[PDB]
Amino acid sequence: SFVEMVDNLRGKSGQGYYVEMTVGSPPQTLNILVDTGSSNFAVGAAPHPFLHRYYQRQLSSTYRDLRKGVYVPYTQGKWEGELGTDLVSIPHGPNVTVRANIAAITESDKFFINGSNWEGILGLAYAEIARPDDSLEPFFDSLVKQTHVPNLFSLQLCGASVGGSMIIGGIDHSLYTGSLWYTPIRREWYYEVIIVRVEINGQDLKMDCKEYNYDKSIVDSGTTNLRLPKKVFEAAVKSIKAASSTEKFPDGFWLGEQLVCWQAGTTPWNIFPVISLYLMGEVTNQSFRITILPQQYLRPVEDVATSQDDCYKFAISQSSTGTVMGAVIMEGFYVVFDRARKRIGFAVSACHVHDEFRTAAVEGPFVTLDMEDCGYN
Ligand SMILES: CCCCNC(=O)[C@H](C)C[C@H](O)[C@@H]1C[C@H](C)CCCCCCCC(=O)N[C@@H](C)C(=O)N1
């Protein structure tokens, strides 16, 4: 019955993917952003210039107040509100209803996005990072505990205004090609994984692999870019710069502060390198790799002015809180969050965006010694 969930995600490029949900009785319809980078379910519950609608507790007969405040800070954006519970369901998801924790957003800062079309957020990670603390059971945990929905979900994010699928409770084989490759969820808080090697156009960056996970490495559908720790970010940009030297860039471009353009249909993709991220595998000394095409880290940005050229923004940015594999990475694949078996699977997506002479891929197996040493402690 997964076909009913295919194509249940929508969104605007760079503004997150959202799924439709209903909260309260009678059911209140809202678009909720899917965030594997957090664990709190929250919805705008008070007027806001960027919100077209919001959760109205006074109109729901099943709403229960928990009489507790809550605040949640993200890499960018934050909100605070009032905790409570209410009945929730997903129209284009499993046919079930569950009572879950809901944070009614009363105040926010740089959280809601103008014209994004979503009014709430669904944190799909674990209770360990839930606010105010791990006692606030996350939505998916509640779903799994109250219903017969298996403990896993998969995300198929399709880039270029964007669409995709969140298959709740299973894997839909019609959405990917080739084999699924699994990497262990290191610890159950963020969906933390371990990167064991990085190559750019087939050349190893040759850094201590701990640097790749310096602090941590997570998979986050709620982050647009591929975010890399300082040292790693610098090595990558240096490499990407050198490979594309035969072109001129505003330099602010490499910081994501300025976009580059080219005459329509003349983008020199061939000069931008593919990036291969090797992830720890399921067996001893075994890993696999996923390769990223420049069409993924060069996010298209429409030019409101003279819509004659194709412009793009560099979607790889520096981080101080570890590596973040955002939409830039996920859009190229079918990603399975197999909580039950504590692993995350990757497979080439059916909606992959491949160029003409190169192909995004998930390949294995590779042999890699001392992978455990790649994890930061
Ligand atoms: C409270 C512990 C968990 C905190 N988790 C996070 O902060 C994760 C890593 C980031 C979240 O996914 C947040 C989720 C944000 C609020 C909402 C999605 C907004 C659409 C994408 C906007 C551009 C973007 O890329 N935002 C990143 C920088 C971001 O902060 N992402």
Side-chain angles (χ1 to χ4, degrees):
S1 177
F2 298 150
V3 69
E4 290 174 57
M5 295 181 268
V6 177
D7 291 350
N8 64 358
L9 300 183
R10 299 167 52 194
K12 290 283 189 176
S13 179
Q15 309 199 316
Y17 292 78
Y18 61 81
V19 65
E20 183 184 294
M21 302 178 80
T22 69
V23 179
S25 314
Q28 289 182 54
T29 302
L30 294 169
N31 287 332
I32 309 298
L33 176 133
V34 295
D35 197 55
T36 57
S38 66
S39 308
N40 281 80
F41 178 32
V43 302
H48 191 287
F50 292 172
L51 294 175
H52 284 168
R53 56 187 175 178
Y54 59 73
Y55 181 42
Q56 290 173 298
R57 288 164 286 177
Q58 68 287 176
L59 299 186
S60 176
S61 69
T62 46
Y63 167 69
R64 298 183 190 170
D65 198 317
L66 289 179
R67 295 175 289 293
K68 184 177 289 64
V70 61
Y71 157 77
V72 174
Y74 301 102
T75 298
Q76 284 168 46
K78 62 173 70 177
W79 56 258
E80 63 182 16
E82 306 173 56
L83 288 172
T85 70
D86 206 333
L87 297 183
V88 179
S89 70
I90 304 177
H92 304 301
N95 303 309
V96 74
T97 301
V98 302
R99 175 168 283 288
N101 287 143
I102 305 179
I105 302 180
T106 56
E107 283 191 63
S108 61
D109 184 46
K110 307 187 308 300
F111 175 66
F112 297 115
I113 304 184
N114 182 38
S116 71
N117 203 209
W118 50 265
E119 306 86 36
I121 182 165
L122 179 60
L124 294 161
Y126 308 89
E128 181 165 347
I129 59 180
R131 296 308 187 82
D133 59 69
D134 69 41
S135 66
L136 194 69
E137 171 176 284
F139 177 78
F140 204 82
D141 286 87
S142 301
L143 176 62
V144 172
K145 193 171 184 177
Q146 290 167 50
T147 79
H148 290 173
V149 176
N151 189 27
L152 81 161
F153 64 91
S154 41
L155 287 172
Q156 175 197 56
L157 307 187
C158 306
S161 59
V162 305
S165 309
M166 170 168 77
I167 307 299
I168 299 175
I171 295 174
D172 188 320
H173 301 284
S174 72
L175 308 183
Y176 68 92
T177 58
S179 317
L180 270 165
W181 283 87
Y182 294 86
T183 193
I185 286 176
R186 190 189 182 190
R187 188 212 303 179
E188 296 181 3
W189 58 321
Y190 279 103
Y191 280 101
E192 189 188 355
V193 299
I194 292 172
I195 294 168
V196 303
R197 178 186 307 172
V198 180
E199 299 185 320
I200 293 179
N201 261 5
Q203 167 167 285
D204 194 318
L205 270 63
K206 293 163 60 181
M207 296 178 58
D208 169 31
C209 64
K210 277 188 186 298
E211 301 291 341
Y212 298 145
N213 313 294
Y214 178 40
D215 183 51
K216 64 178 172 300
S217 280
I218 69 175
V219 181
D220 179 20
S221 62
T223 290
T224 301
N225 301 358
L226 192 216
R227 301 186 67 239
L228 302 171
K230 183 178 185 177
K231 297 188 175 180
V232 182
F233 174 78
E234 304 184 313
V237 171
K238 175 176 174 54
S239 171
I240 298 173
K241 276 183 173 176
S244 58
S245 64
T246 57
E247 288 287 309
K248 299 185 62 179
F249 304 79
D251 175 47
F253 167 72
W254 299 107
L255 284 63
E257 302 175 1
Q258 177 62 301
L259 60 69
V260 174
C261 310
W262 281 290
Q263 295 196 306
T266 70
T267 307
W269 295 112
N270 68 114
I271 73 176
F272 290 107
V274 298
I275 298 174
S276 291
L277 300 181
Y278 290 67
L279 301 168
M280 170 180 281
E282 296 182 282
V283 303
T284 301
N285 299 334
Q286 172 268 315
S287 62
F288 68 89
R289 80 189 184 195
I290 63 180
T291 301
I292 315 303
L293 296 179
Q295 287 89 346
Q296 274 163 281
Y297 62 77
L298 281 186
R299 187 163 62 74
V301 175
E302 295 183 299
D303 190 301
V304 298
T306 297
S307 58
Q308 179 63 59
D309 305 308
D310 298 311
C311 308
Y312 311 86
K313 287 181 178 176
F314 192 54
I316 299 183
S317 51
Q318 176 173 176
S319 172
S320 63
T321 60
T323 293
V324 184
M325 290 168 64
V328 163
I329 296 300
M330 299 181 68
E331 286 175 356
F333 322 85
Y334 183 61
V335 187
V336 186
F337 292 82
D338 192 349
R339 298 155 55 89
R341 298 174 64 168
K342 309 183 193 303
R343 56 180 193 172
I344 295 183
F346 291 80
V348 177
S349 173
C351 67
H352 61 291
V353 180
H354 56 304
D355 63 355
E356 60 185 306
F357 76 98
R358 291 172 298 181
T359 314
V362 186
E363 292 163 339
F366 285 81
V367 60
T368 303
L369 311 183
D370 305 333
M371 294 186 289
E372 210 62 62
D373 294 308
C374 298
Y376 176 71
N377 290 297

